[PDB]
Write a protein that binds this ligand. Sequence first.
Ligand SMILES: CCc1cc(COc2cc(C(=O)Nc3c(Cl)cncc3Cl)ccc2OC)on1
Ligand SMILES: CCc1cc(COc2cc(C(=O)Nc3c(Cl)cncc3Cl)ccc2OC)on1
Ligand SMILES: [Zn+2]
Ligand SMILES: [Zn+2]
Ligand SMILES: [Zn+2]
Ligand SMILES: [Zn+2]
Lengths: 322, 321
Amino acid sequence: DVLAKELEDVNKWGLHVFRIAELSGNRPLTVIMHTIFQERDLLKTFKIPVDTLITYLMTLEDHYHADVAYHNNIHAADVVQSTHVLLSTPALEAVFTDLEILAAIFASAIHDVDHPGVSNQFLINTNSELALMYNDSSVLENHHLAVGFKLLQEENCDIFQNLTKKQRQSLRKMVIDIVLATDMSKHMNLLADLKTMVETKKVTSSGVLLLDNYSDRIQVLQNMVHCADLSNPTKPLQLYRQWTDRIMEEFFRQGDRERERGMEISPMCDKHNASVEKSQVGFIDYIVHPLWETWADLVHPDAQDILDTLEDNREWYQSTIP
Amino acid sequence: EQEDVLAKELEDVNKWGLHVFRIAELSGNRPLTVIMHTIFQERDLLKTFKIPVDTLITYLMTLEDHYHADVAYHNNIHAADVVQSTHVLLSTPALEAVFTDLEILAAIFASAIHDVDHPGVSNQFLINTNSELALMYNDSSVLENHHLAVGFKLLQEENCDIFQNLTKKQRQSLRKMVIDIVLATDMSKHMNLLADLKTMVETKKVVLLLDNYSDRIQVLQNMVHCADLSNPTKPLQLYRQWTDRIMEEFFRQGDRERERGMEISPMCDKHNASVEKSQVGFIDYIVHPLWETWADLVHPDAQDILDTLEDNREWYQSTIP
Ligand SMILES: CCc1cc(COc2cc(C(=O)Nc3c(Cl)cncc3Cl)ccc2OC)on1
Ligand SMILES: CCc1cc(COc2cc(C(=O)Nc3c(Cl)cncc3Cl)ccc2OC)on1
Ligand SMILES: [Zn+2]
Ligand SMILES: [Zn+2]
Ligand SMILES: [Zn+2]
Ligand SMILES: [Zn+2]
């Protein structure tokens, strides 16, 4: 009831995702995905049985770790809802097909599933079986994908059962391309290519973005989901601070884990040598703002208020460095 | 008698155009084991790396056992041949004293495991059928990722860890080079590999000089890549055998495709085949553009390899009706 009222803001940047998580009984990924699928009419279009969709969403969400402070179901829910908003941006109206929309949203939902709360390097340096399976290359991101797809095989979980072989192949390719691009090691080349697109940006008669080949289409989708993944600092300050607390909590636990084991502590993971505020400022300056400024140019002027909030939020963290 | 003829055949171990098919029959289908062991002795790798001999043999036999006997081309003879060809490419004068013993071990081990557990079908067939392997690897270099994982997993079998006396540092560095090398054996990576090698031939520093790890690995990746694509550069009676073997494997995949109502892959249709035209195309578009560029890097070391290639191409041409 109060849930239904929070869920009207689903098309809005700055949805109260933590409140939705409390009111859904820790089912933000399920309720938010279901709402977006109903709103986009994705069950009708792709003939998804509603019970199959809910069983799958529940299974997926169950495979995010409740012990993990940042890379859990709430963050998945947030990235999903953020991608949903970015997909609705005026400059992208009627640009992407239903299957392309479904891919970006499915990709967002599965994109951190079964995340252990430690980095790829931690997994590589411990010689984990996961690093062994994936030859030390995008270990986590390959795992998120294989889990997200594998869950379709559980009882009544195949939400794609009515898609044709061509649709399934197309969808699967797009999902893999998007999630593999969520590895930060790919950040600089994604951004470089977004920049190049902005430099040679074309618009149709209808005033929306022209993307006429797979390469450019997937590039934008990768950058969109990447933007959603890195959208925390662009959110209302009250939301951004809760995300900040959770990432640091998760980073510190990795640091305590590395310390116990006599490993080099990873950057930002030392709870005894932390500058949370200084780190948020550098994060915005070197990563978040460069990316969002380029996105904003791509979809000008749709994202202007997102960028203004970003810039407000950085100044707050600056004001609060000791 | 039969043990003596093997020994005299392995004397050509340092030569291009070893009689690898003879060695396969003479060792009782143990070409990878006998050729790897010979090369490890020839290079003093058992001493340098303090690999116990029983451990080496046990691992080599284990690895060899995980190549498929029923697979016409991507079996243990192919692996023995890539191993031996890499060994010969490593001994080229232009590259003398360039690579460390670990880098040598990396390239040889990578050659050895580069196709282990190959099912005889392409990545695409595995993708299209929704196989477990393609699901695990997200349709991305499915087989090559697998080859690596199997090669490394086999070290964990009883008395198989041939890197047990390597230090933590050596293990970390070897592992990273093997991964880099085998992953470049995916043909989807051929164009960027060639281009990158073309760039290095141009900004060539000289006995070749290699500054960073980017340049060191790039050469090793391309060397193993050349070893992998060396069949047409071999004495004709060997090349003819390799062509017969790849066409048998391709036609078998075609038969499986035809069977399943799938689109038959290029060169896999035995009812619409041009073995001779395809070989000339293979040389012109892939093998010769790469061997020409390797020959340019090691000038003049690969003249005879490149002459054999140009001779074999003209032979296959003559055979076109
Ligand atoms: C370079 C300075 C710097 C500072 C931080 C810490 O800040 C944050 C970092 C991240 C963050 O890095 N998330 C993340 C992504 Cl998008 C992809 N792969 C792995 C990870 Cl951990 C998500 C949210 C944050 O604050 C609310 O990360 N880098
Ligand atoms: C372009 C025409 C063309 C013709 C062929 C057939 O010829 C051959 C092809 C191959 C061959 O393609 N080997 C291969 C490599 Cl190096 C890497 N990944 C997968 C594979 Cl199957 C190995 C040996 C051959 O005969 C000497 O392949 N492409
Ligand atoms: Zn991630
Ligand atoms: Zn994420
Ligand atoms: Zn291969
Ligand atoms: Zn091969």
